[PDB]
Amino acid sequence: KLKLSDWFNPFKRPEVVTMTKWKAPVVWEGTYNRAVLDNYYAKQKITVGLTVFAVGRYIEHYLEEFLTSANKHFMVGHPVIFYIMVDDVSRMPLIELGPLRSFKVFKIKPEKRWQDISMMRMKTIGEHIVAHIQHEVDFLFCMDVDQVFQDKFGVETLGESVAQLQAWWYKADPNDFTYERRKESAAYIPFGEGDFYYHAAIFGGTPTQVLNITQECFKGILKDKKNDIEAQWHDESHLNKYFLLNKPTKILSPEYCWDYHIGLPADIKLVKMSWQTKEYNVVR
Ligand SMILES: O=c1ccn([C@@H]2O[C@H](COP(=O)(O)OP(=O)(O)O[C@H]3O[C@H](CO)[C@H](O)[C@H](O)[C@H]3O)[C@@H](O)[C@H]2O)c(=O)[nH]1
Ligand SMILES: OC[C@H]1O[C@@H](O[C@H]2[C@H](O)[C@@H](O)[C@H](O)O[C@@H]2CO)[C@H](O)[C@@H](O)[C@H]1O
Numbered sequence: 001k002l003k004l005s006d007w008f009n010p011f012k013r014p015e016v017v018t019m020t021k022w023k024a025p026v027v028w029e030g031t032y033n034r035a036v037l038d039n040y041y042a043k044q045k046i047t048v049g050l051t052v053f054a055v056g057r058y059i060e061h062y063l064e065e066f067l068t069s070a071n072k073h074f075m076v077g078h079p080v081i082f083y084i085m086v087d088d089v090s091r092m093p094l095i096e097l098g099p100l101r102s103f104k105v106f107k108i109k110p111e112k113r114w115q116d117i118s119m120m121r122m123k124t125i126g127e128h129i130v131a132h133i134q135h136e137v138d139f140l141f142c143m144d145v146d147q148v149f150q151d152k153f154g155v156e157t158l159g160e161s162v163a164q165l166q167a168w169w170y171k172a173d174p175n176d177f178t179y180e181r182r183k184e185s186a187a188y189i190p191f192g193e194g195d196f197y198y199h200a201a202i203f204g205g206t207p208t209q210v211l212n213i214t215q216e217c218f219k220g221i222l223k224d225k226k227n228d229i230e231a232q233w234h235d236e237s238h239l240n241k242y243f244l245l246n247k248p249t250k251i252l253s254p255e256y257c258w259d260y261h262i263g264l265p266a267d268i269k270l271v272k273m274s275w276q277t278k279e280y281n282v283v284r
């Protein structure tokens with residue numbers, strides 16, 4: 001079957017981290033052979049899912065740009081199902097989809113606090129995995145809507161459990177990571193521990209692993225709320241605690257989720273996806 005050597009060459013990007021101590025690749029531009037994987041996964045006849053939430057002011061502008069860019073760049077060459085969660089379906093925009101792309105739309109009850117809106121994604125994703133997604137796709141990605149694909153986001157990102165390196169912290173010291181540091185929170189990580197700071201804007205895997213990711217994160221969210229404490233960065237704090245305990249089998253470089261407000265160092269060879277401008281006081 002498939003072995004890492006067949007498609008991944010860490011030595012092509014010697015100036016960055018390309019392998020972990022638990023044998024997972026960190027996928028950087030130039031390290032991967034997409035054609036080998038496109039052919040590998042086509043033989044298997046895979047379908048890839050993508051969930052996205054859009055609640056309130058986020059619903060219209062961001063969603064159109066997300067979906068337009070997604071149809072253009074996400075897993076082209078393979079069937080894809082876009083799962084869209086909205087609070088008012090009538091505001092869902094019309095986006096023409098390319099061959100082998102389709103979508104499903106679901107109405108969700110919007111939460112009061114912007115933080116619960118984000119954290120409740122974990123419960124909702126799990127419910128839909130059990131109800132249908134586990135039967136509809138072989139791999140699943142869950143993404144924030146306030147970002148845009150810029151180049152091919154393809155099958156090189158697929159794996160059992162996939163994590164995203166946060167662009168602002170990928171070369172930082174772990175003691176500087178913004179983990180949750182209070183021992184009272186289920187997301188607690190002490191200083192001196194941690195491998196990477198993962199971004200909650202992108203994670204994925206098989207429906208099985210995504211279910212465990214979202215279920216475990218949601219249990220921690222719940223246990224925290226029952227002790228009147230909310231983690232520093234909400235679901236992202238719990239996600240980082242999860243991936244510390246359950247190592248991801250694949251990690252995506254910051255090229256796959258870049259913030260141009262950082263600049264463009266030589267590390268970032270080809271951006272596949274970029275942040276939208278965070279406007280907490282305007283869109284939120
Ligand atoms: O009013 C809202 C609030 C949230 N969302 C959805 O929830 C996601 C998360 O909200 P942000 O994109 O504003 O969050 P940030 O990227 O700024 O901050 C980070 O921390 C958050 C928790 O504080 C989440 O974990 C988030 O995924 C992570 O990127 C959005 O992308 C969107 O999909 C909405 O649609 N509308
Ligand atoms: O720290 C988690 C948090 O990071 C935000 O990104 C900040 C970053 O924390 C800060 O060091 C840098 O100077 O500015 C970035 C842009 O605001 C993310 O926006 C947020 O989603 C979390 O991931």
Ligand SMILES: [Co+2]
Pocket residue numbers: 144145146201
């Ligand atoms: Co976001």
